[PDB]
Amino acid sequence: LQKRWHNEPLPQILPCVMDWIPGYDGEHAPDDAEIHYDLPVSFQPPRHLPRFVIRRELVVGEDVQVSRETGTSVWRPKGTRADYNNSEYKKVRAERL
């Protein structure tokens, strides 16, 4: 589960929608199954057929592991304040002198 920034709020539950599965034990459609009209047959004279749809849930941390964002989002100008104590500047200054 990808994230985008540091304080990105997250849901504890991830609902999922799945197609119903045959198998002749539960050959009849269950009670908690809804019907969706999204079985395509044709497209130019568009034709759709019913399809039984089941619903389940998932929980973050036990099935899906939360990932982290890559790169840098917030952009700031460099604006490096000059320092007169590090070694590199102390040698560059003597070289200029």
Partner 1 sequence: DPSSRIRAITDLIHEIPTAHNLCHFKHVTDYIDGLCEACCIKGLLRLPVFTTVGGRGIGAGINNTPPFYLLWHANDLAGMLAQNWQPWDNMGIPAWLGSFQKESREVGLLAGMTWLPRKVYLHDPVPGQAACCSCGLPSEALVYSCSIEVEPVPKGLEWKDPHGVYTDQGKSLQSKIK
Q: How many residues bind partner 1 (CB under 8 A)?
A: 6
Stretch that binds partner 1, among 11-19, 42-50, 64-72, 89-97 (CB under 8 A): 42-50
Q: Is 21 left (phi over 0), alpha (psi -120 to 50) or beta?
A: beta
- How far apart CA 79 and CA 50 sit, in angstroms, is 62
Smallest separation (angstroms) from partner 1 to the CB of 50? 13
Answer for which of 45, 61, 77, 79 binds partner 1 (CB under 8 A) is 45
Nearest to 8 by CA among 61, 78, 69: 69
- How far apart CA 64 and CA 66 sit, in angstroms, is 6
Answer for which of 31, 62, 83, 95 binds partner 1 (CB under 8 A) is 31
Question: Looking only at Cα atoms, what is the longest distance across the chain?
Answer: 91
Decide if residue 9 touches partner 1 (CB under 8 A).
no
Instruction: Name the residue nearer to partner 1 (CB basis): 47 or 56.
Output: 47
- The footprint of partner 1 (CB under 8 A) covers 29, 31, 42, 45-47
